[PDB]
Every structure is written in C-alpha cells, then in structure tokens.
Design a binder for this molecule. Structure first.
Ligand SMILES: CC(=O)Nc1cc(-c2sc(C3CCN(C4CC4)CC3)nc2-c2cccc(NS(=O)(=O)c3cc(F)ccc3F)c2F)ccn1
Length: 250
C-alpha cells in the first residue's frame, strides 16, 4: 500500500493554508498537504482513504503526481514537489512574456490532463489558473481536486447537480480566456455580487473582443464553445483535445 509510516517525512517550510501545504523531504522533495485532523474518527479516516482512492487513479504527466499518504502524526497527502509558480502567477502577476507557441502548448497540456481526468470519471470541480502549476516553467501540473467564481459555469454560479464534466469545460474555457487575452474576465467590474448575479442569469460573459491578434481564430472559436452558457452546447474534452492538437501543428 501507499501509506508512509510516521517519521519518514521531514516537514519543512509552510507554503499556504486553506488544511496546509508544506515543502517536505522524502526520497527528495515532496509537497505535504496536512488536513486539519490529528485524531481521525473511524468515519473521517474512511472519507480520507476514500479521497486517497480517487487520487490513486491518476498517473499522467499533466496531473500532480500522488506519492503517498500519512496517517501519523497527522492526516496528510504527499505529492511531487513542483518548481516555480502557478499559471495564474505567470499570467497576472509577473507578466511572463510567453510567445503564442508556448501559450498554445500550455492549453494543450491542460487539455491533456483534463481529458485524462474525464476519462477516469473524475470531475475536477475547481479548475482555474491558480491550480495549474507550471513545473520548471514548462510542464502543466493540474492540482487541487482532492474565490473560484470567475471560473464557475452559470449553472454552478446559480448557487446550484451543478458540478459536471461540462462545468469543468467552462472553467477550462475561462483558462483559455486567461491564456489568449493575458487577462482575467470582467476586469472592468470589480464586484463579486454583481458578477454572481450577472453570470448566473446569463447577462454577462467574458469579453471575446479582448483575445489577442495572434490567437489562431480556431482557438478563439474553441474558447467560445467552451464558454457556452448552455451546458449541453459545450464540447467534451476528447473533442477539445483533438481540436487543440490539430491547430498546434499549424
Ligand atoms: C513551489 C511549490 O509551491 N510547489 C508545489 C506546491 C503544491 C501545492 S500549492 C497548493 C495551493 C496553495 C494555496 N493556494 C495559493 C497560495 C497559492 C493554491 C494552491 N497546493 C499544492 C498541493 C499540494 C498537494 C496536493 C494538492 N492538490 S490535491 O488535490 O490534494 C492532489 C493530491 C495528490 F496526491 C495528487 C493530485 C492532487 F491534485 C495541491 F494542490 C504542490 C506541489 N508543489
């Protein structure tokens, strides 16, 4: 089994909270995600092992690698350590001058991981650029599927059956929007309640006039399909992947 016994992991620097993520040492570098629980009930332990079971179904280069789990001294999930920062950081904080070639590659890699998860019947539920780690600045690692409102599909935003393969697709659409515009959607409306109301009712959607000159018109159309307010009108990942790989040639 994939349990790591007590004392094998050396916990280092805290990364962020929400439980808590640390850098650790275990046969090299790992990320250690501490759930806020020291004496699990024989009921929490079962929802934990249940979630571990989900993570263990993934083996793919664009999905954060599951490496094991801890019961003692604390419930914790152990993964590979990623170097660098999230796609969100690159796109919106540091303004990494990515050529359109790289931008497309990132989308393609994101599409690969999502298509993979969907094949294994896993709905992400929280895809956003903060959750796409750009390991060594090259490889997309999709994490955080074991504050999100800009990526929420109208049906999800309707305060709510809403989490589906198609809500993931919509969130992926917002990610394409981020990539192809360099911007977060609704940037000229800094109002959470307003966005919840307007996106929820279908009166507001991302401003597509903002996708850059360089964006293969074929990508812009694909992004529009992913963002269909009408959930059934959205493409599936197999189709999204096929599409992105083909335009990636030209
Ligand atoms: C430099 C660095 O931060 N490296 C790093 C970080 C992680 C992180 S970061 C991070 C958060 C921190 C809080 N915020 C904002 C402050 C930034 C959002 C992202 N989470 C991870 C992380 C660590 C372990 C598991 C997950 N996700 S998970 O759904 O539990 C998961 C576990 C698993 F075993 C396999 C896949 C998987 F998605 C993480 F997302 C994972 C691997 N490497």
């Amino acid at each position: 089994d994939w349990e790591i016994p007590d004392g094998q992991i050396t916990v280092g620097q805290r990364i962020g909270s929400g439980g808590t993520v640390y850098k650790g040492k275990w046969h090299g570098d790992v990320a250690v995600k501490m759930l806020n629980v020291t004496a699990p009930t024989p009921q929490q332990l079962q929802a934990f092992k249940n979630e571990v079971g989900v993570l263990r179904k993934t083996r793919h280069v664009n999905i954060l690698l599951f490496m094991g789990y801890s019961t003692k001294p604390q419930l914790a999930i152990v993964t590979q350590w990623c170097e660098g920062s999230s796609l969100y950081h690159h796109l919106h904080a540091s303004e990494t001058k990515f050529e359109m070639k790289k931008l497309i590659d990132i989308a393609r890699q994101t599409a690969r991981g999502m298509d993979y998860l969907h094949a294994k019947s896993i709905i992400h539920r929280d895809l956003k650029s903060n959750n796409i780690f750009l390991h060594e600045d090259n490889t997309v690692k999709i994490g955080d599927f074991g504050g999100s409102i800009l990526w929420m599909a109208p049906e999800v935003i309707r305060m709510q059956n809403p989490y589906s393969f198609q809500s993931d697709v919509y969130a992926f659409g917002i990610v394409l929007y981020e990539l192809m515009t360099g911007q977060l959607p609704y940037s000229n409306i800094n109002n959470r309640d307003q966005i919840i109301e307007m996106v929820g009712r279908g009166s507001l959607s991302p401003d597509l006039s903002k996708v850059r000159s360089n964006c293969p018109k074929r990508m812009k159309r694909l992004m529009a399909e992913c963002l269909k307010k009408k959930r059934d009108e959205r493409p599936s990942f197999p189709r999204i992947l096929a599409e992105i790989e083909e335009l990636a040639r030209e």
